[PDB]
Design a protein around this ligand. Structure first.
Ligand SMILES: C=C(C)[C@@H]1CC[C@]2(C)C/C(F)=C(/C)CC/C=C(/C)CC[C@H]12
Ligand SMILES: C=C(C)[C@@H]1CC[C@]2(C)C/C(F)=C(\C)CC/C=C(/C)CC[C@H]12
Ligand SMILES: [Cl-]
Ligand SMILES: [Cl-]
Ligand SMILES: [Cl-]
Ligand SMILES: [K+]
Ligand SMILES: [K+]
Ligand SMILES: [Mg+2]
Ligand SMILES: [Mg+2]
Ligand SMILES: [Mg+2]
Ligand SMILES: [Mg+2]
Ligand SMILES: [Mg+2]
Ligand SMILES: [Mg+2]
Ligand SMILES: [Mg+2]
Ligand SMILES: [Mg+2]
Ligand SMILES: [Mg+2]
Lengths: 294, 300
């Protein structure tokens, strides 16, 4: 009844895309990694999660990494070592997101994050990236079955998106991504988390729509469509339009930022959507790339 | 009289809004904030550090002005939970000297002179790790306050909706900075994590900002400052003002009721911050007249 948004899949996909075409216009661009670059990334990912004891397949890594390939801003890239770092860090904390909390070993995993950060970044940037990775994995862990999560995800969209600034990983993403661009304004917006606060709703509403069926099946409550009656087409449509309006208002305000920063913000939101709709992770509730790692 | 005088002041609403705020706190927070009493030695140690830090910028600040700045720390921390009084004094100093920065013409903003003083304060009162977090947060605040003077981003975030506006204020009202320099006071691991993710700041931004904005509106409008949520409604129209004000009270209440899901120590800290800021704001000459000897623009 409320267990699926499948009836709305085609209409909502078309409405998301129309919104992007009218308000962002320019398509996101996929970063093409060389084979050598992709192997270096996947090798670092496997090394980082090996102490945790679970095998991750190449195609699951590729499912995770696609968000970085599609949602950065390739024409503004300056530092491909920072880009590779974001690939690795994004992927290995994605595994953490998918893991049963019994597998979460901070003593084994935190040094791996530190190693990744020092390898690919300079001394100061490595500290910023590591703290943000540390804060993300700690947050994902401590909020599993937390009353705080229950209160923030069941009260209002406002409370929910406030939780997601950290929990969807976008604050972490900004703080590990600014070395890719070496653009002083973007670096400040990343470090104040204004960059994350501006892009949270656009990332989260899309992720939530397409991951609803999986999350509802697993008992995960971190999803804004749980705030509406999805079995009621009229109530769903009103809620979905309110969320579309949220995304538009953010995008229109993002266009007040400097031309480079606004490119990075918009490529992030629109790229996430392109990646989400072509990724098997977001298609069936349980499959070989989104199954709980138990 | 070409000016929109009718929209230039919330003075007609002063008594009724103050009473409504207080009723809200009494119904939803209940327990009073507690003022930290500093020794005369401690206070003088704080003020001498404050004067040392802003001396390179060229402007004298009176003890009365410092005391006007420092009261928010005295009233809005959580005395029952304090473990580290050196961290508390760091927050007194860091709060006060960045208040001066907030009040200064941007021509006085000298990062080369001022950033080393902030680093010196942090290195004096905190351990090495805590000092780096507090310095980064102070740096990011003073850089933000400077960057956004006359900025199109500020205009867009402050004139679109309450949601865009409060998103700006998570940094601009200084509360993220506040959390990241206050967690060493409490040495409470959950509070430290909520500080470092900025969830602490996000939970408390609206309660701090709505109160600050109401009582600093007249001064800010007279100085042409646009960072104030009541510029989003027509304060000259009583019906529209009261509808907007009720919407802001509802925002505060929703945050406070969600804050009550946090662990007991964290929620005490969050609620003392919001309610203490209200007690301080309503007792402080800074928030009583548009221009006076403690809130006037510090001019180049
Ligand atoms: C941050 C970005 C734009 C996107 C937004 C959706 C995301 C793919 C989903 C999710 F799985 C996260 C929370 C776990 C990993 C966190 C960061 C690194 C990645 C967070 C991901
Ligand atoms: C460095 C301090 C702490 C920063 C500096 C200027 C500030 C905007 C002043 C004002 F708005 C305060 C007294 C209300 C909220 C207090 C804290 C959370 C942060 C307050 C701010
Ligand atoms: Cl560096
Ligand atoms: Cl934030
Ligand atoms: Cl320390
Ligand atoms: K809306
Ligand atoms: K409201
Ligand atoms: Mg998650
Ligand atoms: Mg997940
Ligand atoms: Mg390095
Ligand atoms: Mg999801
Ligand atoms: Mg397969
Ligand atoms: Mg200010
Ligand atoms: Mg001010
Ligand atoms: Mg004000
Ligand atoms: Mg009028």
């Amino acid at each position: 009844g409320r267990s699926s948004v499948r009836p709305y899949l085609e209409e909502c996909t078309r409405r998301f895309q129309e919104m992007f075409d009218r308000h962002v216009v320019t398509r996101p661009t996929k970063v093409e990694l060389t084979d050598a670059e992709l192997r270096e990334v996947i090798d670092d990912c496997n090394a980082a999660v090996a102490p945790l004891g679970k095998t991750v397949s190449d195609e699951r890594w590729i499912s995770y990494v696609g968000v970085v390939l599609w949602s950065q801003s390739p024409r503004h890239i300056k530092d491909m070592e920072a880009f590779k770092a974001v690939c690795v860090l994004n992927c290995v904390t994605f595994v953490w997101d998918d893991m049963d909390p019994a597998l979460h070993d901070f003593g084994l995993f935190l040094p791996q994050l530190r190693k990744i950060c020092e390898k690919y970044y300079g001394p100061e940037d490595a500290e910023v990236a590591y703290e943000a990775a540390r804060a993300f994995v700690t947050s994902d862990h401590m909020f599993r079955d937390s009353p705080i999560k229950a209160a923030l995800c069941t009260t209002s969209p406002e409370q929910y998106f406030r939780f997601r600034v950290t929990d969807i990983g976008v604050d972490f993403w900004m703080k590990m991504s600014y070395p890719i661009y070496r653009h002083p304004e973007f670096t400040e917006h990343a470090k104040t988390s204004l960059a994350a606060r501006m892009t949270t709703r656009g990332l989260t509403i899309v992720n939530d729509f397409y991951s609803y069926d999986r999350e509802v099946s697993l008992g995960q409550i971190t999803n804004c469509f749980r705030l509406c009656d999805v079995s009621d087409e009229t109530a769903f449509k009103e809620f979905f339009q309110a969320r579309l309006d949220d995304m538009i208002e953010d995008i229109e305000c993002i266009k007040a930022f400097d031309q480079l920063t606004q490119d990075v913000f918009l490529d992030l939101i629109y790229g996430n959507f392109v990646w989400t709709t072509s990724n098997k992770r977001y298609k069936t509730a349980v499959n070989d790339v989104n199954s709980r790692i138990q």
